[model samples]
Each structure stands twice: as C-alpha cells, then as structure tokens.
Target: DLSLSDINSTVEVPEGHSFWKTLLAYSGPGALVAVGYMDPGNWSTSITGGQNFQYLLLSIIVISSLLAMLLQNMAAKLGIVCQLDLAQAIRARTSRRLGFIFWILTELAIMATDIAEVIGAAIALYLLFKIPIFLAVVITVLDVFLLLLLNRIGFRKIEALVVCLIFVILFVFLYQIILSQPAWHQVAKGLIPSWASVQTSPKIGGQTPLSASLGIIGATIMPANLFLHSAISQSRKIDRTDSSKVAEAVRFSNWDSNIQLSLAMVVNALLLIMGVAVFKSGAVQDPSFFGLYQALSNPDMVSNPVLAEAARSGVLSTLFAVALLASGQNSTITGTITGQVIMEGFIHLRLPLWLRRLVTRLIAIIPVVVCVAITSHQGSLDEHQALNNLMNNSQVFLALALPFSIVPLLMLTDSAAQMGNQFKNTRWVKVMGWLTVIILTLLNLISISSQIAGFFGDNPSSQDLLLSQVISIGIILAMIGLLIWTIIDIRRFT
Candidate 1:
C-alpha cells in the first residue's frame, strides 16, 4: 500500500544493456538515501569528532558507512525480493497493537531527523542573512510548499535535485578544505583505527570514546533511511516474479549505495579535517555549525594565517552556509517521503503528499521554535552551542530507535517463508546481521551511560553522583531488556 501506487513501476529499464547503463538506471535512489548520511545533523558531530580528537574518529565513519552499505542492501533486497518496505513487512506479521507501537516509534525517528534538518537550516539562515533563529524556523515552513512543487513535477526530477544538491555540498567542502591544506599522511593514518589516540584525545573529556562513536554511528546509518530505501527501491519498473531481473536490480542497487556512501564518507571526513587543521589555533572549544561559520569569517577566531586571510574575504563563510543550506533542504525532501512510507506501510494511513509534508514539517518546527525562544535569552555562544547540541543529539535518538527497524528487516529478509530460499540470507549473512545488531546495541548503551553521567556534572557531590549512576544503570538495563524482547518477538516471524 505504501508502494507509491501511482508512481510505482513508472521507471523503465532496457531488456539488454551495458553494465554502465544498467547501473545508471538504479543510481537515483542511492543518492537520495546518501543525503541522510551527510545531513545537517552530521555536520556538528563530524566537525567536533575531528576538532576534539583529530582524525582518530575517522575510522568510525568508515566502519559506520560499511555497516550502512551492508544494512541498506538488505533493505533493498526486502523490497525487491519480498515486495514490501520494512514497515509493511513487519506490520504484516505483528498484531495491530504492536504495529501501532512501531508506527509511533517510527514517527518519533522521523521527527528527530527533522529536528536536525530544521535547526541546521535555521542556523544557516542566521549566518547568511542575519535573520533571527526564531524567524528562520518559521521560514522553513515555506519549504513544505517547495516539496509540493517538486512532487507535482515528478519523482525522477526530485531525485535529480537531491543529487545536484549533494554535489553542491561536496564541492563546497572540497573547495574550503583545499584552503586549510590538511596533512595527507595524517589523514591517511587516521583511517586506521588507533585505540591509543582515541582514548587519549581531549575530546574524550573524561568519558569513553563511546559517546563520539555513537554520534558518528547514529548520524551515518539513520533509521528513517532504512525505511526510505526499501520503499524507493520499488520505484524502478521490474518484473518482480523474474528472479534474474530481481537479482540484477539487487546488484546495481548495492553498487549505487556503496559508491554514493563512499562519497558521503569523504564529505564527512573533510568536515573533520577543516575543523582540526583550520580551526585548531582558535582555541575553539565549541565546534558547532554557527561557531564554524564565525571562525571562518573572522580572522581573530581562526589560527591559521593563510586561512585567516581567506576568511577576511568572507567567501569561505558564505560557502559554508550555502553547503549547510543545501544539506538541510536535501534532507527535508527525503524525510518527507520517508514519513509517508512509514505512515502508509505501518498503519495503513494515507494523506495527500502536500498534507503529509505540511503535517510533518509543522510537527518538527514546534521544538525548534521553542528552542530558539528559550535560547534567545542566553548569550550568543551559549545559544548556538545549545542549538547545535540539540540537533546532534536528535541523531542519538535515531541510534536508539535503530534496532527496531534493523531487527525486523533482518528477520524478514532471512526468513525462508518470506523471501524464499533463493533470495533468503545465507548462513554467514545471518551471522553478520546478528553481529551488527549486538554491536550497535552495546555501543548505544555505552553512549547513553556516558551522556547521562555527564549530565550530572563534573563535580557532583558523592550522593548526587551515586544517584546519577543508579539512574543511568537502570536506563541502560531497560534498553538491553528491550533488545532481548525484540529479538524474542522477531523469532515468531522466523
């Protein structure tokens, strides 16, 4: 029912074609999916990852993207092989009550994503036009109308626009980082995991690397994107009954995802490099997006002489804002469709595209508007940092909600009854899928523990510290219990 019934099977593929041509036909969905990987939510985390710990966290980005490739392939396979997006597949097997619970969780995941998108765009507007952050949040409502216009045009055109905006972001970073002149050897070495540097880095801030790792993991492999990929993979016209054609579609879709994700990883790395190399001398304790923009524009805020000279021209700052704007808008388009997919696939609810877009946008704006109002009374530095933290942590919520989608996708794809033996996951594939789930859950626990501990403060009295630890342990235990419960529930499908 969520198959874009009107647009499904609208794209045609040639019967016989060259490898390049075949790959081209399946390219758009991956690009659309890739947008989520490098959205505004990621900018703060990526830069802070580099600024605080330098290149030590770069390896996390690589690992996260590889995981993303692995998971996205399964999502595409579910749609191609089973003819159902993730939500629909899960809903088909679960009770109505369970389905409703999943729908609410998915809705929260989408709202979390939109929080980052809205804040990122609003901050970009403040940087470029000096608009108040509150008004900027209000202005993002107009983008809903932009979504309306794009839908009227065509889905392919929407994909093309997303790809174009991605290029805009890629090139903008490429140009700006070229000015910073990063050390290639260090960047290369950073790609290799180093527990020593990762542990010793000041960014660790008396906590484990779990916090930064979760931020990267959460930002890179988003929850809504899993649902979106499964739904969009069905956009291409394919004879689902033909196993050979289905196999081909799966192959090309995997290729497109890996290639585009590689590019997204590079962009994230460049963001970190810019932070470490360009802003290092500025005593930059805060690496928020607005902080980065101000540092780029003002010589006093930047330490590098060459970069400072360039900043005097203000071109780099403008370019940074432009990239952020592009990132924000790109994510909005994907988030809108993903919301629709979850609503229809899970709950069997339908609304006009325009109405759906408007409703979601309106829901997302409420938090940002309130945040801007509360922070307006605070100092500028505190205000911007608070806003950036709010956006980045929204990604952590996505990380928390990730298992719900991943567990269900793995169960459905590997089940012989659902995919048939020919397309079902093999033994090693099942092993890797379970491995991913376990590792992700453990990491999330570590992150939540560290974040809660920090919230209690650096110099809490003995009694307060004890109370905070007790609460943190209770929450982590509850999450682990939820994971076990989900695993037990998923076995019913198998």
Candidate 2:
C-alpha cells in the first residue's frame, strides 16, 4: 500500500559486529537522491552559468547545495519515521478529490524532470555519433529498457551502479579540467560570493548572470528529487521499533546523505569549471553542449598553449560525450523510480512494472519525439538553440512548480501529529524552511515576469508588448492561485 513497496525494507545489515556495518547499511538512497542534483537537468544551467559568467556564479551552487542538504534531511526523516514516502504521506492527509489534483501536480513535475533527461541523452548521441537529432531522440526511447534490466537487480546494486556512473562524470570533467589548465587561483576567487555575481548583467538574452542564477537554483533543487529520497530512505531495513535505533538510522542517513551530496556538489563545480575552461579563457563562444564537446576537441578553441596542444592530440572530446551519455542513463534510472513512487503513492494505482515504467517514460517520449522532430525540421533556427530554449523553459517551469512541493513538504514534516513528537521538525527547521519557500517563490515570480515580458524579440507591434504583459500577469496570477490552493489543502492535514 506504500510507495515503492517492492523495494521497501529490502536492504539488510547485520550490525552485531560494529557501528561501521550499520553505517554501510544505509549508505544508499543518498547517492540515488544525489543523482538528480547532477543529472542532465542540471547540465545546461551549470554549464551556461559558467560559460556566461565565469566562476562568478559558483557561489550560487554552494548556497543552493547547503539549502538542499537541509531540505533533503527533512525528506529522509519522513520515510524513516512514518515508513511512508512523500507522495503517500501527503495523500494520507489530502482528500481523495484533492489527492487526484495533487497527483497531477506531481506528474507534471516528474514529466518536466523526464523531458530534460531524455533530451540530454538524445543530444549526447547526436554529438558522439553524428546521429540526426530526430534519430537520436528515437534511439533514446530504447533507454527505457536500461531501466527494466536494472529493476531485476537489488536496490543496493542499483545504488552502486549509479555511484559508478556519477564517478565517471566526475572524473571526465576533472580530467578535462586539468587538461584545460585554468588558472587555479582565479577559479578560487569565484567560490566566494561577490558583487561580481550579483551586479553583473547580460544586463544585455535580456539573459545575464542574474537570470542564470534562477536557472541554477531551479536546476539544483527539484520536486521529484525530494520525493525520491522520501521513498527510498525506507529501502534499508532497520529495527524501527526502538527510538534509539530509529535515531541511529536517522544519523547514518544524514551522514550518507550529506557525504554523497558533497560529492554531487563537487561534480557540479567541476562541470562549471569545465564550462569556464571552454568560454571564460579563450574558447570565445556561446555554443550548445555540442559546442562544449567540440570545444573539448578543437585545439583552436583553447588559448592555453599547452592545453590547446593537448586538446588536438587527445580523446578529451570523446570523454565528454561519454560522460554525457553516462549522466543521461543514470538520471533515467532514478527518474523511472521517482515516477513510479509518485504514481503509486498518490493514487494507489499499481500497473505492471513494465507498464508502470512505460506510463511515465512513454508519455514523455511521445512529446520529446514530436518536439525533436519538429525542432529538427525548423530550417531557420539552430537546432541546438531551439532545444536549449526548451531546456531553459523546463527549468523555469520547475522553478515555479517548486513552491507547491516545498510547502507541503515543510507542512507535513513540521506537524508533530503527522511525524510524531520525536521526529517532527524543530522550530528552527520550520523557520528556515518557510523562509526558503517565501524567498524562492518571490524570486521565481521576478524571473518569470522578466522572461515573459519580452517574448516577441524586439517586435515593433504594440499588440506584442501588451500581450506579453498580459501573459506575464496571467502566469503570475495563476501561480499565486495555485500556491494558495496547495497551501489551503495542505493546511487541512496539519
């Protein structure tokens, strides 16, 4: 009856020997949760922020990661304390009528998550093999099979595979970065938040350091990721009957969670460094990720004389594509599981495992296939630009959708009645959590208002500007209403 019931309490640890065994027992779920932070959804923004603004935006990644650790800690506790995933916990509180509505909300968020994952894989294939974007997207549909094969394996093995892929991505960037020979001192300067990141402006896509920050935040924190952790924290079997044992599980989960998250944070910073290496020094371009891959190979793209020479003679570019391929596949695995968790938890509808997988991926693939086909057919715009535009839109949409998830997560975790006195969020956790929600909601609305206000691109028509303003107001109002609705319904539970 619970979410991911098949995997529930599936991992075993014999801890009579030592505390180390107990720690090893719960080391997973964190890495799986960590995957979403580094997935393809993250690549575009993390890279773009670096390319567009140098390491100036690196501070944003650190700040977001710090916040993410807090949010996910709360999520992990929910699963362990209640033996319920996020979706099930919320549904337990919501009426059946509203449960369906909330399910739609979660589904939209999951599909948005899938859109980024699938497109990135397709683009990776297109880059490595010179496959047509259309054919490449069609080929990505076969990746769903990768998920099926992994399902037969145990959850621990699955976590190991994901961490392995994560390392592949981590090392590829690390290798390329060393080869790039970026000035380490200058890179260090960007790690500290400076006025450089804030005051600087593209203050030109009507995009700049400021707008990119929104993308970075949106891309970093995701709705599906939180829900995934909430469910998967229940994967390890612990003696939950005693409060001390439950506390032990919680502590280890936090340790494993923060440790993997730190790695994920490092992996992201490496990608940003690579992005900086591409454009900040001597690459001189705003190209697509393929642009990034090509830059990885083309010595002319680099100014570091030694590094330029190295680029011409090495498999640097090949490794970049391979890394991209690994990330796409890794993300697809988690995305499938998250989709299942949300569906089963929200509606209590359990399709066959294969059919369940198909519903989320298949629903998304149809749109992805059609969109890629249409975008490829557009003879005028660069295919990369068109697709990257899709990438940007999805991230922005996620930014808006985020508040709904954040509010309910905070509400449920804060309530002692729901989480029990021992496990409920502390006063400080509630304060910080609400503060984050308020800040992010306002920040997204600001970003969206500006983004929508100029859709027609220097059009001379009065109708265009008027329509643009109206649409901006429409989105703002609609989001406000939706936020109110979610808050009102979630209130019933607390």
Candidate 3:
C-alpha cells in the first residue's frame, strides 16, 4: 500500500464525541468532490437541456446525482479500507501493460475535465471585463499559483474557500430561480421522466432530447471525481485496524457526500429552470455562459414581464457573472488535485506541489489556447461562440473515458480480499454497483453510435454513408470488445 504521507490527518475524532463535530471533520472532502458536480462545464448542458426541452431532462440530473452518491461512497470506502486510491489499487493487481493503458486513459480524463474549467473561466472573464478569450485563458493559467499558495498553508483553508464558493453559487441561482417564479406543477412533473415532450419537441435546428440527455448524464456523473474522491478520502486519518473507527468514517463520509451533492443537484436544477423560465427562446442554441448573462440583462432578449424588470435594472446579470466566475475557479481546485493524485498513484512519480500544479495547468492551457487561436483566425469575433461550442463538446470525451474509471472502481471495491472483513461491499451494494456500471456502459455506447450516425446523416452521400455505417460498426464492436477484455482482465484477480 502506497500510503499518502503528504498530509497526515491530525484532526482527532473520538467515537464518544458529538455527532455534529465528527461530521464537521469529515465535511471538507465532500465539498471538494462536490465542486465537480456544479462546474461551468455542467451549466451549458443543464441550461440548454432545459431551454430546448423544458423539464424533461430534469429527471436525468436526479438520476445522475443518485448514481454519483452511490459511486462516491464506494470511492471513499476504497480509500479508507485499502489505504490506496483507485489507481494504486488497480495498479497493484494488473500488469504493467494494463496499468499503462489505464494511466493514459485516466490522464486524458483529467485533461478533459480541465478543458471545461479553462474555457468557463475565460468566458466568465470576457463577460465581466471585456477581455479577449485568448488573454483570459492565459489569465486563468496563473491561478494555479494561487492554489499552490493555499496548499502550502493547510487543507482546512482550502476547504473553507471551496465551501465559500459553493455558497456563492447556491445563493446566486436560488435568488434568480425565485424571481423567475416558474410554474410549480410543471416543475414537479419534470422530476419524473416522460416521452411526451421528447417526441413533441422539434429537433430540426435546436438540441435534440437525446443529445441533451447524454450531456446531462456526462456533466453530472464525472469520471475524474472517482479518482479525486478516493484520494481525498485519505485526507482524514481513520484507523483501518479498528472496526468502529472505519465504520464511523464511512458513515459520516456518506452523510457529507449526500449533503453536498444534494445541494449541487439543486444548483444544477436551477440552472436548467433559469434557462426555461428566464430565457424564453430555444433559438439561442448552444448557450454560452456569456450569452446567458447578456440575455439576463437585455430587455429585448427576455420575454417574461417580471424577469424583464431585472434585465433593465442590470443587477441580475452581474450576479450571474460573479457566480460563473466562482464556479470556474472552484472547479480548478479539484481538477488540479485530481491530476496530482492520478500522476502519483499510477506512475509513482511525485513532484513538488508547485510543479505539479504548473504541469496540470500547462497541459490544460495549451490545447485551449491553440483551439481558440485557430477559431479566431478562421472567423471574426464570432469565434467566441464557436469556442463555447467546442468547450461543451469536450465533455463528450469525458463521457467516453468514464468506463475506464468506473469499471475498475467497481472491480476493486467489490473484492472482499481488498476490503477485508468490515469494509467489504454488501451483496445489495455489489448488485447496484454492477447495475450502474452496465447502464453507463450501454448509454456511452449509444451516445457514441448516435454521433456517428448523425455525421453520416448530415453528409448523405452514398459513398460516405457506406463508410459511416462500416465505421460505426467497427466502433461499436471495439467498445464491446473492450468491455469483455476489462471483465476478463479484472477476473484474473478476483
């Protein structure tokens, strides 16, 4: 076991202490993990999902959050019982060949997560200060040093800042949702899945229900959080040799995860609701963070009479932009920390904290800078919107990369040998975990197939259509093969 001695848990927790105080000690890690659930990457998906097909996709957010709670609890258990993060656990069992493959896949997942934060922060800057997107991205790169500064002090201070940012996002959306005064009955109906709107909603130009639904799933149950959660769970010291201590840590960790993620669920739902109630037109396809701000402030853009009142007043837009800024910055903290964990655990390479932060930020920044520069060279200032669409599309890769993380997590945590007597997953837990893994695998395969079909559908040439069908068949078969390989490979251990 590669014990994380970087930051030993010094906060003492006695079983005899009050419940609240014990929970307070376990609180920080969940907030750090919950930060991923509400980042700027999720905003476009949630909002556009609402604006295009009002409330139908709300069920997706709810289901995804529940899945997240279950998965994150397993992640916490893996760390507490095995004393290893997901990567290290997997590496300990698999060959060097398999571990290297996973390391590549997981690193790509981390980069995908960072791509969203970089674009979101850059866009927030443009919305608030009129800076160019390219320069704003450069500005965002410098914040890694801010994290480095915070790291030097202590983990609690980092948790404090994360909790503070969560409130900034929470209140901002809560106020806007209240002001919009959405139809209560319709809001309630949205919580349950329905095919009525899915069929009726025109998909000629706007986002189709299938696309929005996948985006919501991808945005909510992130792959990177699994790695991040396992590592952060080790931040608090629990005596694994003692059954009571292990049980107590698991109990409060689950409580903290559920509490924080529930708050995140509300924030995501409001983002979607604000899209439907405030911005009346679905014509604003691929809604950017800046576009949402401008729509909130422009009287001509907003139709609701009451909402129009605030558009003219201009305060609503400011609040929304500030929240966007907070969300972008908040996500960066978790993203950087996750990158470090993945690197160290998978490869056993440890660098100074400052260097680790720089390496992560640099990798995230280079591609974004290049993409924006390329788009800008091709078009005028309209490149900003084009870049926003690129940002939204990056989450698709995150969805595709999910199985590599999710499958291994299910495999590792289900093993009694690894978890020992007290922390082994129950029979029901194993059943549910496998069910979720299957559901996610099938959904990802479908999403991938749809994108391929859509590409050929747009082209419509005979030669290209044949090529597309062949290519689609190959991809589907490859994914199926990979799934079988993973199961067989993991079976070698169990």
Candidate 4:
C-alpha cells in the first residue's frame, strides 16, 4: 500500500512523490509571480515604446531577461535555503526599526507595482468595453474580493485558469505579430546595445517621443520582482539544507520562471508590435508636437475608429485586455499573500487579509479614478494638457523608485552566514548586478532631465532657463549619489 506522509517542517515533504506532480507544483509559485510582470503596466509601456522607438528597445528587453534570470536564481536560493522571504530574513537579521521601515517600503513597492497594472487595465477596459475609465478604475479597486473568491476554490485551479488565460492572450498576440510581418532588420538593430542607439530619438522638428518606450523595458526588470520571487519561492516545499534536491528544485524553479517570463516578454513585445504596426504605421495619427495637450482637450482622439482599430490589432489585444483584468485580479491575490509575508516577516505584525487588501487596492485606485474623472470633464485645452504632462512625468519618479527593493535583496543574498552554501553570487554576477543598477540610474536621470526640459518652453528668460537646468543637474547628481551609496552597502554586505 502506498501513502504520502505529511512532514512537520515545511522542508521535509519527502522524496517519493511522482516527478510530474512535483514539477507541476513547483510551476505554481513562479507562474503567480510571472503574471504580474506581464500586467497592464507592461501593456502601456510596451505599446508606447514600440510606437515611439519601433523596436529599438527590443534589445533592452532581452538584457532584462538575462538579469532577471540571475536575480531569480538568487531569490530561489534564498527562498529554498533560508526558508525565508527577503523581508523576513532581513527582519530576523536586522534591528526592529530598520526592519519596520524596510517593510513599509516593501509594501509600497508592491502597491506601486500593482497601481501601474490597475491603471493599465483601466485604460484597456476603456479601449475595449466602451466603459468610462473612471468607472473601470473604481470597479477594479476592490478587485481582491474576486480573487479571494477564486482562491477559496483552490490555488491550483486559479493557476490553471490563469495559465490558460495567459496562453490564450499570448496566442492572439503572437498571431498578430506574425501577421504584421515586422521588419526583422529593424527588430535586430533594436537588439544591438550601442550608446548612440537609444539616444537617436526620431523627433519631428526636434520634438521628442512621448516617452522613450525602450526605457520602459529597463523598468520592466523591477526591484519589486526580487521581493515577489523570494516570497513566492518560500511557498513551495523544498529541502533547504540538502544540496542535490535543492539544486534540482532550483533548476525547476528557474525553468518555471524562464518559461513564464519568456511568455511575458513575448506578450509585451506583441503589445509593442501591435502599436508599431497598427498605430505607428500611419493608420492612426501619431501624437503631435503638443499631442499631449491635444489629447487631454480631446478625448475624441482616442475614440476614433482608427484608435479602436489600432487597439484591435488582433484577437490578442482583446484577449490581452481580458488578461489585463485577470492580471489585476491575480495581482491582488499574490499581493495579499506577499503583503502578509512582508508584515509578518518584517514587523512581526499580521493584519487580516481583508484590511491589507482594502488599503492597497484603495491606495492604487484613488489616483487612477481621479485621473479618469478629471479627463472626463472635457476641460480647457491647457488643463487637459497639464494633466497629460503630470501623468507622463510621473514615470520619472517610478523609474527612480524601481530599484530600491534590490538593495536589500543583494545584501541578504550575498551574506555567507545567511544563505550558506546556497548563496552563489559569482564575481561576474556581482558585476552585472551593479551594472544593472548604474544603467537604470543613468536612464532615470536622462528621463528626469528630458522631462524637465520639456516642461519649460523652447526659450525661457535666461534666468528661468538656467534655473531649470541647474535644478535638473542637481537632482540627477543627488539621485546618482544615493544609488552609489546603495551599491556600496550591497557590496559591503551590511
């Protein structure tokens, strides 16, 4: 007679389980984490980037995958060995106050990450369902209740459903890209990482692209994914102390992440390709030099048949919209668990799931609702213009904040005492990690500088223009200094 034994410790699940069953179970955590990467934030970023850069940042997306793989392996190790999420381990090793502060930031990172997706889904809903953006945003605000209901059925069923949805979303998009027949030459050139390449913006009479879409690719490898990955990995049953089995599980987890993220990358690339082929192909009008202002004054620009046509590039964008909504729902579920992980792991405080879900959803929803509401007013040209500028410019802040989660991860991952033999950040890995940090810092600086320059007219009074320039340079320098300190701390393993 064959029977399974339940081990007291999470680590001791025993070795007699069927290989396929063990492998399928391992797939669960990574898929949950991977879905967030392909959320609405990605939809906007990828589509806008492709519209602006025409595949120029495709190379950046590839590089992000390489970095993600490296970081993910470390996170898996930390999860499997220490049997602790990054925040939990940090709380254990650091002072209570420090833990609490970091913990708060971790929650903010998760919420900020979710906010972008929620907004993106709201936008997608507006695109597809003829719904008011404000209402869509409000509707998705308490998205957690739907997810909690789904989870009540069982986590495996939820993943299975999401996985099917993701593929259906993916299949439609890939079909469209294949249909559009993007120039492989341009796509290949996009992959090449020359300094001058990204700088070569296609402008009309010196007007910049709405945002460097490629830069969003850099933003895609978010700092929060580190926290999410480590936390998710902890949910799996794996032997932390056993080298061979841990290695096996780690290999499977890596495979899990790679498959899921590769799918995400492909879907994001499809979103971009759809934008490029359908919108930027001159089927829909490109935003003008002051397109930002015009769009605000005229929501009609979006309701045009061409805009809808551009959006409906394939069954994919439609599936993608549904996927975006599903992604928001999935995120709330994951965020609840992750928030719980952070709260207990860091501060030894546990808020009930309802309160945590409510607070996070509300925080993300309010701004989205307000933006949509204001846009609906059909306000004066300048008012609409200013709102557009505000939303576009907020990305600079998001870019700056994106990397903070990594500082803690790198410190904890590299500590020999913490991760023991499983902590395998090689010399090259350290170099790449620091390099990723520096590149993202520089991009954030450039994004801020360019946006500030755009904020002012072509020519201000000498004094005013000089002041703007000085402030931009000073802010960038200060930002770089902060990043340098973070790098040093990570290096020192403090």
Model 1 residue 467 CA deviation in Å? 7.2
Question: Model 1 clash pairs?
Answer: none
lDDT of 1 by residue, 144-165 (tens): 7787677787776777788898
Give the runs in model 3 whose Cα sits over 4 Å from its true position: 1-3, 15-17, 193-211, 218-220, 281-283, 379-381, 449-479
- Give the per-residue lDDT of model 3 (tens digit) for 1-494: 35356764556565585889888876888988887788876676677777777787788788889888998889988877777888888777776666666666666766766777778778878878878878898999888678767777767778767888988999998887887788978889999977654453566345677667665554446777888888888888777777877788788789988988888998888888877777776634546777777777887766578778888998778888788788878655776677667777777777666776677778878878887888788874656666665665555566566787888888878877788655788999889888988878777776765556554434578887777678877877875776677778777788
Candidate 2 error regions (>4 Å): 14-17, 200-209, 278-284, 378-381, 450-465
- TM-score per prediction, in order, is 0.91, 0.91, 0.91, 0.77
- Candidate 4 ranges with C-alpha deviation above 4 Å: 1-21, 181-217, 280-320, 379-400, 445-494
Candidate 1 lDDT score at position 170: 93
Ten-residue region with minimum lDDT total, candidate 1:
198-207
Between candidates 1 and 4, the TM-score winner: 1
- Among these predicted structures, which one has the highest lDDT? 1
Sorted by TM-score, highest first, which candidate order results?
A: 1, 2, 3, 4
- On the 0 to 100 scale, the lDDT of residue 484 in model 2 is 80
lDDT of each: 0.77, 0.75, 0.76, 0.60
Each candidate's clash count: 0, 0, 0, 1
Tens-digit lDDT track for model 4 on 196-222? Answer: 434646763232343453455456465
